[PDB]
């Protein structure tokens, strides 16, 4: 059993590939969560931005099961996101400075620690700092939210392109 983009837990407008590892956005922000979530320990997954045409954008990260599928990631209390445009961090629809932007060809890294809890983002194997600490308790799922026709690919592991050497984690694939 593999960790994949959930067929049951997605916005209908998103275009999910047959292998359930690739996703294309459609118009206004909408979301897909993975098939498996985490409750304790340190976990990791990667996202590759395959194509990001002009005006398109992504908000990538982690969402609890109640995260609104018809809204960007970071919209409500249930999720925490990292935006392609300006590297902004979002939670409860509040954008805060975090990193510089990301786009086409970039490999983004997603770390979560649920012991003080932490959310950490990586860009091409570079730790971008602690985006959020002492997060809302519950189960967290790898999550993708896309604005317009951009294409992203999710890698749950075990083999990452840029595996972090700075922190201990299990790949999301260990959930499978």
């Amino acid at each position: 059993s593999r960790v994949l983009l959930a067929l049951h837990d997605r916005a209908p407008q998103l275009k999910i590939s047959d292998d359930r590892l690739t996703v294309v956005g459609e118009k206004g922000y909408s979301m897909v969560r993975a098939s498996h979530g985490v409750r304790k320990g340190a976990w990791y997954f990667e996202i590759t931005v395959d194509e990001m045409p002009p005006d398109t954008a992504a908000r990538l990260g982690w969402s609890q099961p109640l995260g609104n599928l018809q809204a960007p990631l970071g919209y409500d209390k249930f999720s925490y996101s990292w935006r392609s445009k300006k590297g902004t961090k979002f939670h409860q629809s509040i954008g805060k400075h975090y990193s510089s932007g990301y786009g086409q060809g970039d490999v983004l890294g997603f770390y979560i620690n649920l012991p003080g809890s932490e959310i950490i983002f990586y860009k091409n194997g570079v730790n971008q700092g602690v985006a959020y600490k002492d997060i809302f308790e519950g189960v967290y799922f790898p999550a993708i939210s896309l604005y317009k026709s951009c294409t992203v690919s999710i890698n749950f592991g075990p083999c990452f392109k840029y595996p972090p050497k700075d922190l201990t984690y299990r790949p999301m694939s260990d959930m499978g």
């Binding site: 206004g28 960007p72 919209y75």
Partner: peptide, 12 residues
């Protein structure tokens, strides 16, 4: 005519 923006749901 208004079209949905990337920052549609954002407060800040």
């Amino acid at each position: 005519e208004y079209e949905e923006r990337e920052s549609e749901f954002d407060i800040e």
